[PDB]
Amino acid sequence: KQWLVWLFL
Amino acid sequence: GSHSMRYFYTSVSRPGRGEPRFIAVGYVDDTQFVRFDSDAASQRMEPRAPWIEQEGPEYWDGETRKVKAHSQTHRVDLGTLRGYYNQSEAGSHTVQRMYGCDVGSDWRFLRGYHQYAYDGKDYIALKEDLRSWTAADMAAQTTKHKWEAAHVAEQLRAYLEGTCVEWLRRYLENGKETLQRTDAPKTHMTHHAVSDHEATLRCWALSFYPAEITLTWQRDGEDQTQDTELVETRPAGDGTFQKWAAVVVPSGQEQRYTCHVQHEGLPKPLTLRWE
């Protein structure tokens, strides 16, 4: 299962 | 032994032609089990292994929503990096992301990783203490500061040490017949006459899993690393892999050359000699 958070650069 | 779950994401920008192409793939060890293609009509996370189809529609709904979120984050990251490097919109650019977890023989969390790359080169990565980030440029330095401010490392660590490993375990259990297996390589040797006095000996390993293997040619028991041609491990297309290694030898000296095969499916490494 994938990570739930939205990660931005 | 140890096992791994890893998700890979790739988004390339198409200037003026439309939104960036986005493709995501999931792997357990060396077996792919899911995909997403933003150009595909389904617009769903699709199964690619037989043992993941047992998941109900809720699992797929969740994975589709998550992968679309990651697609959106990449869509923003493309412009963010175009700005950080002062590049014109006319250029097509690539952003690659990869994260996951490894587990030991006790099926306890062994390690985790999370890395980004821009236009083919490292951008930022998570350190193996799962508390800090390694950055390459000053733009990666800026992203690192942002993530240190937002406490990204703690959340990522929690995910990797809980849900990543738990569902790696669950995938190993659901697909035990596919994933918890080792296929020893079927090996043989080939002899051709390159010239009137030289001949190529080729050592073949076929139909093995996992992909981690080692082929070595030796002469008088001495490593021939510099004069042996060794192709990359290649997929057979059915869950198994292939590899071969060749040397050119003077005619009449083949009995001095040996091919050594190392693979997890072999109790001892194999030694092959032409007959």
């Binding site: - | 790739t10 792997y27 097509s92 690539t94 990869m98 236009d119 083919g120 192709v231 997929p235």
Partner: protein, 100 residues
């Protein structure tokens, strides 16, 4: 921005035997950027019944793909893989050697 030229391998899923079903694999790897063109040629013509895997990449961040089709190899049938990439000034062809 680094570029990388595709490494090409042409082979069969199983050891080829004349007159029995097999797959003709063309594995392209190590290339960058992702945009690449691949064709599987029989006796010069390109096969239409061609599939391919999903884009992935290795530890060096370079991409790899696998193109394949169902065929029955016969002695006297030429098979090759023709790829075109940005890092190639001309399309690259690799003939299928039954022992490679």
């Amino acid at each position: 921005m680094i570029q990388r030229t595709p490494k090409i391998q042409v082979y069969s899923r199983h050891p080829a035997e004349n007159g029995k079903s097999n797959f003709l694999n063309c594995y392209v790897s190590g290339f960058h950027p992702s945009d690449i063109e691949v064709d599987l040629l029989k006796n010069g013509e390109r096969i239409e019944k061609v599939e391919h895997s999903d884009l992935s990449f290795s530890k060096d961040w370079s991409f790899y793909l696998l193109y394949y089709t169902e065929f029955t190899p016969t002695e006297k049938d030429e098979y090759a893989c023709r790829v075109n990439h940005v890092t190639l000034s001309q399309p690259k062809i690799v003939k299928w050697d039954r022992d490679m």
